[PDB]
Amino acid sequence: KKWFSEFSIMWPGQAFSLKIKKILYETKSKYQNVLVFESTTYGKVLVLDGVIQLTEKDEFAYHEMMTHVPMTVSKEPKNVLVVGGGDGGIIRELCKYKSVENIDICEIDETVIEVSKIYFKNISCGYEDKRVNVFIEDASKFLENVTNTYDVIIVDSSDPIGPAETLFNQNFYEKIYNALKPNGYCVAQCESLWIHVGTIKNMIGYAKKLFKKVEYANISIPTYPCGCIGILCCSKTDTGLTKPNKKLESKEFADLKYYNYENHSAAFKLPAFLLKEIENI
Amino acid sequence: KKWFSEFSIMWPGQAFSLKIKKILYETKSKYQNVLVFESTTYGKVLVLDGVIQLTEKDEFAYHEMMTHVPMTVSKEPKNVLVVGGGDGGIIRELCKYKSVENIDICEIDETVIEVSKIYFKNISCGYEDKRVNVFIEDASKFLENVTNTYDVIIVDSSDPIGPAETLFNQNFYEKIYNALKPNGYCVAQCESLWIHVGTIKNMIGYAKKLFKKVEYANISIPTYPCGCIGILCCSKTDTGLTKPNKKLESKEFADLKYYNYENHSAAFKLPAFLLKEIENI
Ligand SMILES: CSC[C@H]1O[C@@H](n2cnc3c(N)ncnc32)[C@H](O)[C@@H]1O
Ligand SMILES: CSC[C@H]1O[C@@H](n2cnc3c(N)ncnc32)[C@H](O)[C@@H]1O
Ligand SMILES: NCc1ccc(N)cc1
Ligand SMILES: NCc1ccc(N)cc1
């Protein structure tokens, strides 16, 4: 048995590895290299341009926290946009809210969707929901063109090298601002406090040029580099996203494996050094 | 340049790797294999039996949280025992409390101490403190024999395979109980919620057979497996260790890089699935 290893200039000097039970599918799509394997201990794994995007064992931690943070703060969210997220995990979590009327997803690479429907059936099951509408386009252009405004936008992107390069700049954050309702919320994958503090500061800086309240929360997930991933949180009201306005008690949420009411606020209690770096932006 | 890789039957199917700038020292001590290298991005690294024990870039997260959790809850701690901890990082953090009168350390392998004094000078600097007394012995025997009782015991062990095998059993926890003051606290390295839940349950079960209040807290640290490490927390009073009784405001604590008042309590807000596994023990 061989091993998959995740090396990158975005985290030089380190690498994480998973033992391969069997390769399931590889291809070169119009945007990126796509790989899918069954690991010996983390179940199935999806890779894009050499970088791990999810595994069945732990994806629930990142998908539950990116979704339920903003969706327990938003009072009555009707219309939600997912940027990126071809795997469908966010969408799966959004579907659990009966009151949601529409879920748009803008994903640049339809191969990701198709591969996920074929190889990750418990992650892509929400595509079946009649409220979901798929657009295959660069979200940088989609957000320049869209007529609707959203109650919540969840930016489930890949990393800045590759097709997501258009999603980590000031201009993208203006477009997010303009496409949210006046009391709307954005959350965005914002990388690892252990090694990407220069990025994190830039992103916070971009977001603060527009939004009243910009916060940062941290998620424990073994299969992203350094064992964790941040959520950059944007709010038009001074109140922000650390405090849920509701509990998730109905039967659609019984199965939740990471998120709960308490760890929502916990996730925003950051390490001393990050606070010190962040203040003064 | 070669890479160091951390493979183990304690985390099958995964491995974490660091790029090696230069090997500094290797030996076979009476208890274990010892390796020290300078990494390209994490600074210097100490390995024992193929397993990473610390790196200069991140050790502060594990050393600050294991120490300051219990030391902000203990009202006036006079006498503290460190089990394991040859590197001296706990001791470094303990020395910052002026009111501490004595710090005992029981480490089985003196080579670890010596290597740390030579190669990790900002981690071992606390050995110079006149309050510190070193015993070279298996802590399982030391705790059977010691006459003093402690206000706080910090069990900074290596993993269960190797010489620390005597420290992950019921009998060790009775010895810890008997060597604490009647209002005394123990904290112990208790592994990763992502992959060691069977262990975590056993340890909680051992601790609950004796202690009034057993809690579990989680630390984000990129260089342990799965990106995180737990602290098993033992308390003789129903009040427990989630809430600090003091703030660390004096000049000896200004330099702290992870711990603060808020993230003390945050660290005990665990993922939904762990709560579900833990309840009923
Ligand atoms: C896998 S979840 C992350 C997803 O982000 C998608 N992605 C990257 N860049 C963009 C973009 N500019 N617009 C929409 N989706 C993107 C990737 O194709 C990937 O499927
Ligand atoms: C490096 S911090 C962990 C330390 O635990 C020490 N250790 C392992 N087993 C025992 C034991 N039974 N008693 C004391 N120290 C131990 C190891 O030698 C190591 O230096
Ligand atoms: N789309 C989530 C994600 C997070 C971190 C990394 N590296 C890649 C994907
Ligand atoms: N002594 C701290 C420690 C924690 C986890 C592992 N694996 C090894 C050492």
Domain borders along chain B are: 1-57, 58-281
Interchain CB contact of B226 with A (< 8 Å): yes
| CA-based nearest distance B46→chain A, Å | 16
Residue type for B280, please? Answer: N
| CA dist., res. A68 & res. A261, Å (int) | 10
Subunit contact A258:B272, Cβ cutoff 8 A: yes
Closest Cβ–Cβ partner in B18, B193, B256 for A13? B18
Q: Are strands B150-156 and B79-84 parallel, antiparallel or unpaired?
A: parallel
Cα–Cα distance for residue pair B38/B41, rounded to 1 Å: 9
**A106 in ligand 1 pocket by Cβ < 6 Å?**
yes
A111 ligand 3 Cβ < 6 A: no
Residue A277 CA: distances (Å) to CA of A20, A202, B132, B222: 39, 11, 34, 19
Alpha-carbon span B113 to B139, nearest angstrom? 15
CA-nearest of A118, A199, A109 to A162 is A109
Of B226, B263, B275, which has the smallest distance from its Cβ to A269's Cβ?
B263
Instruction: Find which of B7, B63, B193, B194 to mutate to test the A interface (most A CBs within 10 Å of its CB).
Output: B194
HSE-up (13 A, CA, CB side) for residue A273:
14
Contact yes or no for B14 and A16 at CB 8 A:
yes
Which helix H or strand E contains A128, and what residues bound it? none
Ligand 1 contact, A55 CB (< 6 A): no
CB B179 within 8 A of CB B149: yes
DSSP H or E stretch at residue B263: helix B261-266
**Greatest distance between any 2 Cα atoms in chain B:** 53
Binding-face residues of B in 106-125 toward A, CB within 8 A: none
How are beta strands A44-48 and B44-48 bridged, if at all?
Answer: unpaired
Name the minimum distance, in Å, from the CA of B177 to any CA of chain A: 31
Q: Which two three-digit tokens encode residue A248?
A: 């998730």
Distance, in Å, from the CA atom of A149 to the CA atom of A170, rounded to the nearest integer, reads: 19
Q: Check CB contact of A262 with chain B, cutoff 8 Å.
A: yes
Among residues A87, A104, A151, A156, the one annotated as catalytic is: A156
Distance separating alpha carbons of residues B177 and B188, to the nearest angstrom: 13
Q: Note the CATH architecture for domain B58-281.
A: 3-Layer(aba) Sandwich (3.40)
Helix (H, G, I), strand (E, B) or coil at B262: helix
Regarding the beta carbon of A112 and ligand 1, being less than 6 Å apart is answered: yes
CA of B157 relative to ligand 2 center, distance in Å: 5
Which tokens in the block code for residue B48? Answer: 């024992």
Residue B250's CB is within 10 A of a number of other CB atoms, namely 10
Residues 6+ away with beta carbon under 8 Å from A152: A70, A71, A74, A77, A80, A81, A180, A184, A185, A186, A187
d(CA B276, CA A254): 12
In the PDB record, what is the listed experimental method?
A: X-ray
CA-CA distance, B26 to A273, in Å (whole number)? 33
Q: Which of B12, B218, B266 sits opposite A269 (nearest CB)?
A: B266
Cβ pair A46, A158 in contact under 8 A: no
Q: Is A156 a catalytic residue?
A: yes
What is the C-alpha radius of gyration for chain A, rounded to an integer number of angstroms? 18
Q: What are phi and psi of A112, to 5 degrees?
A: -60, -45
Q: Taking CB atoms and an 8 Å limit, are B14 and A17 in contact across chains?
A: yes
Nearest Cα neighbor of B81 from B101, B64, B99, B98 is B101
Cα gap A206→A199, rounded to integer Å: 11
DSSP-assigned letter for residue B161: S
Cβ within 8 Å, pair A12-B5: no
Q: Where are the beta strands (DSSP E) in B60-119?
A: 79-84, 102-107
Sign of torsion over alpha carbons A38, A39, A41, A42:
negative
Interface contact B22, partner A, CB < 8 A? no
* DSSP state, residue B17: E
In terms of Cα–Cα distance, which of A244, A81, A85, A102 is closest to A178? A81
Residues of B in contact with A63 (CB under 8 A): none
CATH of domain B1-57: 2.30.140.10
Q: A272–B256: do the CB atoms touch at under 8 Å?
A: yes
CB B89 within 8 A of CB B54: yes
> Residue A98 gets which letter from DSSP?
T
Catalytic member of B156, B159, B238, B255: B156
Tokens read off for A89? 């995990």
Max Cα separation, chain A? 53
Cβ–Cβ under 8 Å, residues A4 and A47: yes
Is B255 known as a binding-site position?
no
Distance between Cα A10 and ligand 1 center (Å): 17
- The binding-site residues of ligand 4, defined as CB within 6 angstroms of any ligand atom, are B 51, 53, 156-159, 189, 224, 229
Give A42's contacts in chain B (Cβ within 8 Å). 13-14
Q: Determine which helix (DSSP H) or strand (DSSP E) holds A8, and give its type and residue range.
A: none
What does DSSP assign to residue A143? H
Within 10 angstroms of residue A167's Cβ, the number of other Cβ atoms is 25
Contacts of B194 in chain A (CB under 8 A): 58, 220, 222
